[PDB]
DNA sequence: GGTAGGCATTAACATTTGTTAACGACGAT
DNA sequence: ATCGTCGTTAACAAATGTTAATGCCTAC
């Protein structure tokens, strides 16, 4: 929003200025660790991780204007080895390198408070996500994940709320729930067709009972009501 | 932590007096206190959430010098409704009104980078924990939770390493994962002495093959070394 | 108006958790 | 003495890790 836009035009007086990233490119990865502060101005990405085993995990989706750190400021070392994979067709991102960031945030306080705000939104997001996922099984982890995407990328239509996102493979949907196999997801996904809360037509997910999803993930719905009110209010 | 000691003195030069809370007291609360910045100087505490029915959830343990926040910096609204509950002897904590924080941080960049660092150490922490817990099921959750409890609260004794806490009822180990009955958790710890990794004595937990834990929660073990090296180094 | 991989669906088992119910001791009012 | 607390087990009801085989698709 407004705050995001002036951070945008804060960086551009200071000689760091965007880079186009395209689908499946990695702004940074878990094998070649460079420590950045990524200001993703526009587009859609996902934070992933491969293990010494090939087991994939979709931690989180970053969208719109947001900030992703790969380095600590005061120590300038890595925070953990992850992947910021682009999902949208294109994405603009401001790749600030970490031992630059302190001097930048020092000379303007309005914009540190911005990044501080987002990292606050992030701490509260993870805790919420962790809470609702951990209580009742993978089914909860699915309903939680669906509800997230349904709020962030959901659109109105006379057959339900559309999760308008590239091609959310069911294997990918399980990847956010820490699931290895599509069959485990297919089984769950249409307990949610029969219970009439989810349909899968046009190879895209349509939500029918938002109140169902809310019950299985109340801490997250709360997080939206508090940290992203404008979004939360579109679907009420 | 030498960085926090300066922050305590910094608070005291501003008339911020420490308050003493003591076992099972709630510094801030699920039914909106709020919102404060909580500088926890000494003691041990836990962050919990109670659902509408009665299902409880132990999201994180906070210990020693750390800083919690229930409010966003700029808007001073809630970041979510949780409980900070004193688990230990009786913690010492500086409770700062949030409106007072932005001003306090605005005029001493050193401490204001310090707060940012702590908040970076938990966005990283939360993510790592989300990862190891989501994969490898709830057995992996217990082991991952055992893991962080050793690194933080672990002495090494001629009987392995002692998880040196109060009274960690397996009811409570339980609340760290999402396992809501104390018999399911008992079926786990059971299976971990039979495999020689933990022994239950003196109403306290001991770990003697910590290597077994590090495989079930690798990105947690990776997180300590990366984020909290001094803590990691004492067991490696 | 035709091909080959890529997923979704669904079945059949192998384990892991969820749940309830007795039984038994420690520790505190 | 009489708690409520906590740990421990067996016994089961679901839940979900797996793998395999059958089909509809769409990128090509």
Author numbering:
A (entry chain B), B (entry chain A): 2 to 237
From the paper:
PrfA activates transcription by binding to a palindromic promoter element termed the PrfA box (tTAACanntGTtAa). Very recently, glutathione (GSH), either generated by bacteria or derived from host cells, was found to be the essential small molecule cofactor of PrfA through allosteric binding to the protein. In this study, we determined the crystal structures of PrfA-DNA binary and PrfA-DNA-GSH ternary complexes, thereby providing new insights into the mechanism of PrfA-mediated gene regulation.
Each PrfA monomer consists of an N-terminal domain (aa 1–108), a long α-helical linker (aa 109–1137), and a helix-loop-helix-containing C-terminal domain (aa 138–1237). The second helix of the helix-loop-helix motif penetrates into the major groove of the DNA, with S184 and R188 forming direct hydrogen bonds with the bases of T20 and G18, respectively. The majority of the intermolecular contacts are between PrfA and the sugar-phosphate backbone of the DNA. However, we did not observe conformational differences between the PrfA-DNA binary complex and the PrfA-DNA-GSH ternary complex, which is consistent with the previous understanding that PrfA could interact with DNA in vitro even in the absence of an activator.
